[model samples]
Target: MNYTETVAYIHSFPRLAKDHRRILTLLHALGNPQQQGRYIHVTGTNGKSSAANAIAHVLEASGLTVGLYTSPFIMRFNERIMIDHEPIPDAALVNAVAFVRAALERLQQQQADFNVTEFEFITALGYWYFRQRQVDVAVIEVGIGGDTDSTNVITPVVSVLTEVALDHQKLLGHTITAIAKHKAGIIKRGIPVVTGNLVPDAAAVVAAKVATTGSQWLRFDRDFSVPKAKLHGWGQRFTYEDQDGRISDLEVPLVGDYQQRNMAIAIQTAKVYAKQTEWPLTPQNIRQGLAASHWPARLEKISDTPLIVIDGAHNPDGINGLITALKQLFSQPITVIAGIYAAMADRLTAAFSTVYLVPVPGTPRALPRLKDSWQEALAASLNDVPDQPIVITGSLYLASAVRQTLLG
Candidate 1:
């Protein structure tokens, strides 16, 4: 099948399939790709993608080319698995998918009940691609909960939880502790795990998990921190202090209030990994990475024509981040562009009035046809609201569609 067909084939399977059984078989049959490379596996309810990118930024700044595998692309499918900010080349992606497809077919042939889901296939492909490229390392973001996540197949240099909340309550358990337990599943027996900006209950859950696994754990607010900063319109200027060392006046291209904490998590993760694995994750390297890292759709400026920004605010907390960021960066009554997916769109009743709902490109979900097109809808949203920010968000999938036209 072609790349598009192959992606559809992979997604044709259920989005969630409960365990790693099918992926294990597929990977082993194709080649033990998960064992062939080194990794930093990341998990959480929000900030996982941006946090993963922060870690990649640090690694790249260290002069190492790294593979980044995260889910729910902002602008395109290839955005999901990229090397050094560039999406996988078309030929490479098609080849990888075809290879995984063949392996899955063979697996189910051997065991009639063997099954591989969409996320599982993509997870296998990422590890396999990273191994084939011989990248120095890869940073993988868990899709959904970690215990049975397909990406959990490998042992990472450092496992990171980028902040968990009560999300996916139906699939993962409902309570914060239940979801926290699922996120903690990525913590291996001896690996040092890093916890991102989390609440007390969620942090306690991680503490308990580390105790059970015998893994050393570090907390973002407690063990590592970034002082509150004077915000620049489009960026941050601050200091990061952790056990590794402290760097003053470091900067990140991200503008959200939550982002510095995420970067600190990456910085601490790298710092701790050096001590654990004897790798040279120097303070200079960490600082340079934070300075150079750029993950779009997290307060990214795409258009200055009318001055538009794109963000991936898919949950209540995420929406809060977007609202906080908008108020800090630039302010208007706030005209928001929303992607009308069920879970993402349900919470649009936050703090804004003007909203333009657009359909996610790949899914069957459709936005209300208020005007002839999304552009028209957006234009309508901004007609009378002036001086405030016009933001596009909802889900990463929705933002992906929005970014193509507004690549500004």
Candidate 2:
């Protein structure tokens, strides 16, 4: 199958699977590639992609080929799987899909009830591709709840829970205790699990899980921490210290305190992995890798002329972080081009100068005062405040649409 047809073929599968049996069967059919490579499994309510990307970048900077797997692509589906920071090539993706399809057909023939979800198939594809490429380590991010997540099949070298907040209540359960329990599933027996600065309730949940698993719990502030960060013009500089030593002047292009926490988790994960593997990691590599880590649409400044910045603050916690970052970055009142849920827009209305509601492509209009399109919203924002900086945010999907339209 060609690229388009292959993508469609993968999409044809259901998004929700009953259990991990189908994924286990599929991977076994494909020669069990998940067992052949090392992995760093990451999961959280938000910042999973950012932390996973940073971890992979650090590993890659140390001269090892690193495989990265994350969800909800900004530009292309290929963005979900990468080797050494590059997306899986179109030819590679096509071949991988074809291979997986053949294996699935055989599995279905043997067991009529065999089925796999889209995420399960994609996770299998990433593991297969990473094995083929002979990657040193793969950073696998959970698609949903960590316990039942398609990417959780692997026993990782290190498990990282970036942060546990309210999200995916329907599938993961309504309370933070239940949700944290699901995420804490990634921590394997005897393996290390590094966590971000989680709230008391979530941290207690994870702490209890760690007790049962016998995993080395590397709590954020206690085990490893970022003291403080000074926001440079477009970036921030901070110091990361652990039990071993301190890595000063750790810099990243991204801004915000949430990002700082994510980076700290990434740094600690990489350090622990390096120590476990005996891979002679240096502070220089960590600094360079962090400075080079790039996850787009997280406060990404796309245009200088009109001063347009786009962020993927989809959830309430994320929006709060964005608002904090915005206030920290600029003194003047900023214009907002928002395409988000009505509940999320309430805070922006009180904070920003102008909130221009625009239609997100797939989602129903949740916010009021809706405009026809993002173009209209942009025009209106510009007309209302010519010099004020504009931020298009509230959803990653919105950022994806805007990034594709303007940058492409």
Candidate 3:
């Protein structure tokens, strides 16, 4: 199968999860390759992908062939699995899908229920490819709440939990502590866990889990601290400190104050891994790796003339970060062009309305079923603002859609 054909075939499968047995059976039939490598499982309400990508870049710079698995591909489905910042080749992606499909067929013959969701199937493919290629390590980002997430099958050498927030309330929970508990599910017995700054209640849940599991728990304020940093277009500079050591004037390329927290978690995770494993990452590598790391759509400025910033601020916390980053980066009276999911209209409007809001040209509005119309929602949001250069953002999907239209 070719790349297009492979993607088509995978899309043919239904994504509903009837039971865990379906996914487990499929993975077992394929030899369960996700279990082979030293995995760094990351889970959080926000910053999951950024943390995982940063870890992968750091490990790669330290001379390890690292595999990174993330989700909601920006351009291609193959973007979900990468090594050294490059997507898997078309042939390899096709072959991996074929192998999984064959294994699923065999499982079906055994009369087993092995219904893997789209995300789980792609994750399994990444593991299969990484194991086959003998990757030194694989950084896996949990797609949703960690406990029952498809990526939970692997026992991570280290688990990094980014900031917990009130996203995914339906699947995870409504409160911050409830969300933290779900993300904390990645904490395994005897493995070290690093968490970004958390609310007291949320922090307690993670702390309790680590204590019960006998895992080394490293909290943000208690174990490591990221002092207020300077953020320039080139990068960000911050002071990272812990009980054992302090790295002052630490620099990284990602933008936003939130990125400081993400970098801290990545650095702390690497430190713990070095202490437990034989491979000790050097300070130089850490500096270079972080400076070179790139996770797109987080405060990413794609164009200058219009001062457009594209970000995947899908949830409330993410939206708040976007607002702060924009205010800090641009002093001009900003014109905001936002494209949000229908469910997030009220919050997006509330957050970005200080500036002019041009609704993404064709995005759906938040409304009960049958009443939602993106055009109307956008028109209403922009009813008062006049035409001006704008900061276009909100949903990554809408950003992607707009980009595609403008480029064509």
Candidate 4:
């Protein structure tokens, strides 16, 4: 099939499979390219993409060809795989999928009882592409719950866990400890695990897992942390340190305490990474990577007049971070254009002074007690509070819409 059809086929597969047998079988049939590459596996709730992106960039700065794979692109499908921040070229995508698709069909012809999910198919494609590029290293972000997720096949050189919180309760689990266990699944025997999670119970669960697996565990504030930070308008410049050493005056364009915390995780992970590969990773490489990195739709400041910023904070923990960041960034009360699903409705209403409920256009699943769409919220906000530093957030889909509207 062609590009559009291939994308459609991949999309047609289920997002959460009953089991990972389909992907495991597919990888085995396709020569298991993931096993050929050195890897850093990152898993967590909110900061997975930002932290994975930072680690990949730091490795690249250290003069290595790093392959990065993350999920739920703000726009294009090609974003799920990248080298040096460039999405896989469309031609490369087509060729890789053709190979994987052919292998999948061969399995089907053999009456393979396994079934591959959409995420599984894309993951297979990413590892294959990384192998083709002969990357020095690969950074993998677990798409969902880590234990049974499609990207769990690799024995990574380092496992990085960002902060854990309640998210995807249905697919993962209902409690903090349960979710933490699933995320901590990336912790392998004798491997090093780096985490910024501070929750006592969650950390306990993760540490237990690491101990049982014979993995070395490093927790933020205990093993590594940012001891100081000064806001620099573009973002925050901070000092991050672990047992290996420290990165002084590291500048991350994504400004916030949360972002700095993610930076600390990235820093320590990169430090462990350096040891694993015997690469000469310097503080300069960390600084360069930090200054060069950017995670869009995440505390992204678009307008300077009133200082508007857009973030995707859909859950209670995410919104709590956003609320604190907004207050940290702005002294005045916020003009909020919030688009929320029912599950998080109560948690959002109190964040800003002027709250307007906007319906998310693509989320009809935002059923029960939801209000206006983002288009409607944007229109109303423009008419009501045009020049205030409007904070647009609460949904990634709405973040996409607001960004498109603002840019256009």
Candidate 5:
């Protein structure tokens, strides 16, 4: 199968649990390539992509070949796996897909009965591609909760858990601690775990897991912390401290106060990597790498005209972060062209609508039509706010549709 065919075939499967066995069987048959490279698995309700991207940037800047696997691509399917800050070459992707098909077919012939979810197949494909390219490290973000996530099959050198919140309740669990338990499943024996500042209950669960598994763990408050930092238009600067040393004035180009915590996690994870392996990364490399990191869709300003901002802050925690960032960064009134998925509308409207609400053009499950009209929703939601700078967000699907409409 070619890359396109491979992606299509994998995506053809239903997105739920029935495909789990096939997914694992395919990955296992492919020799579990995701485990070969220095693996860093990240999971949480939010910030997985940001944190994963940060790790990838740091590793790549330190002169190591890195593979980054993230989910819910804003533009193209290929955006999910990035190498050295670029999407994997099409030829390489095609080759990886062909290999995956053959291996999967062989396993199927044996009546393997193993099924992979859409996310699982993508994760496996990333592993295969990374292993083929012989990447020095792979930074992987779990598509959902950690325990049963296909990515968890690999033993990571370092595991990162971003802030836990109430999302994906159906699959992961309802409560914070219940969800934390599912996420903590990724913690391997003797692996070092780095967690962002979590809710008290979530933190307690992680602490208990660390104690039970004997995994070296670092929590935000006890092991490392980011002091109040200055936020300038250029970026945000903060001081992150741990046993190795203090990285002060660390600058990340992404906007938002919550980013400081994300950066702290990235810095601490890098320190753990340095200590665990003789990767030869210096403190200077860590600082430079962070300064150079880029993760899109989080306070992304694509146009100055009308001052449009594109953020994939779909969940309440993320939406709250976006609101905070917008309030802190821009003084002008903001208008949002938001395309909310079915699951996210209530929280989004409650958290956002003080600005402007441009209803997304289409349904939540599929790609959005760029030409669909949002003027009606915008009219109803705006009420009296007609002069604000527009901010479009909610779903990545909406973000993509808006990007096409504006840029194309």
Candidate 6:
């Protein structure tokens, strides 16, 4: 099948099936490519994608062929798997899917009940693709809860939990403590763990997990940190410090004050992984990588004609980050188009008035829709609130669709 058909076939599988048995068995059938490449595992309620991409960038700058695997792609499916800052080409993705399909057919012949979800299949495909490319290292982000996540199959050289808060309440748990436990599941015995800014409750849980696993804990603020950045027009400049040394006046193109912590986590994780794997990493690599890293849909400024911005702030914590960035970056009145959780819409009142809700692109979950679709919401925002900065947010799904429509 071609790339389009292959992606459709993969998406035909269920979204979740709870346990990792299918993925484990599937990997075993495919010769366990996950074990071939070294990895740094990352999981959190937010910032995992940004942090994972930053780690990959640093490793790539160090002259290693690096693979990056992230979920819920902002634009295209191929964005989920990238090597050396390039998304998997269509030919390579088709080949990977075909190879995995053969393996799945063989496995099903042995056990008639064998099955794998979309995420599980994609996770296996990424591992096999990275191994085929002979990547020196790969940065893998968890698709869901850390321990049970399909990507958790690998034994990473370094583990990073970027941040933890109450999310995925139905599947993971409702409380911050419970969600922290699930996020901490990525920590393995004797592996050094790097963490980002976390609440006290979540931090305590991760700390305890590190103790139980006898792994070295590199806590944010304690072991590594970034001072308040000197805010500029679009980006910020700051200093990143760790136990080893300090790098001053580092800059990242991404906005949002929360990104400072994610950048810090990436820097520390790269340093720790290099030390663990005996790979050479210089300060220049870190600076270049941080500066080069770019994550879309995180307070991304897509247009300057009318000053429009878009963010993938799906959860409450993420929404808070978007709100904080809005206050920090803009002085003009802003208008919000929210296509996310209705409860979180109230938070926008802190900055804007009368947020317009719409259906999240490509999802069945019901949400109050002021405009039937995101397209309508965009039109309404433009026509109804002229001369104000239009900020589109709520779900990454919505952000992806809006970005594609507006930017294209």
Cα lDDT computed for each candidate against the true fold: 0.77, 0.86, 0.74, 0.81, 0.74, 0.85
Model 2 weakest lDDT span, ten residues long: 361-370
Model 4: which residue pairs collide?
A: 358-372, 359-372, 359-373
The Cα RMSD in angstroms, rounded to one decimal, for candidate 6 relative to the true structure is 2.5
Instruction: Estimate TM-scores for all models.
Output: 0.87, 0.95, 0.86, 0.90, 0.87, 0.91
Off by more than 4 A, model 5: 1-4, 15-21, 112-115, 341-356, 364-388
Better of 1 and 3 by lDDT: 1
Clash count for candidate 3 is: 3
lDDT of 6 by residue, 160-180 (tens): 998876666777887889889
Clashing pairs in 1: 74-400, 302-408, 303-408, 331-388, 332-388
Model 3: which residue pairs collide? 22-113, 22-114, 363-374
TM-score, candidate 4, is: 0.90
- The better candidate by lDDT, 4 or 5, is 4
lDDT of 2 by residue, 1-408 (tens): 889998888889985535677788899999999998799999998778889988988888888889999875476899899899899999999999999989998988998877888888999999999999999999999988798777878899999998877777888988988999999889899899999888998999988888988999898899988886899878898999889888887789988877888899998999899998899778999888987888588889999888999887877777887888899888888888887655667888888878888877677765355688888988887887778889998877889988998888
The prediction achieving the highest TM-score against the true structure is 2
Regions of model 4 farther than 4 Å from truth: 14-19, 112-114, 305-307, 332-334, 341-353, 365-372, 383-385
RMSD of each: 3.5, 1.8, 4.2, 2.7, 4.2, 2.5
Q: Which candidate gets the maximum lDDT versus the true structure?
A: 2
Better of 2 and 3 by TM-score: 2
lDDT of 3 by residue, 276-384 (tens): 7789787777788887877566666665554455666665556777777776776656555565444355554554534333344444544331113333433443454
lDDT by residue (tens digit), candidate 5, 1-408: 666776687679656542245556777798867557788889988777777888877777788888888874467777888888788777777777777767877866877664556676677788888888888778888877888777777888899998788876887777998999999988988999999889998999998999988999887867888865887664787788876668777788888777777778887887787678887777678888987776566677777654556677676557667767776887754555666543345544454434334455565445422213445444443455545556777766677766666666
- Ten residues in a row with the worst lDDT in model 4? 365-374
Candidate 2's TM-score reads: 0.95
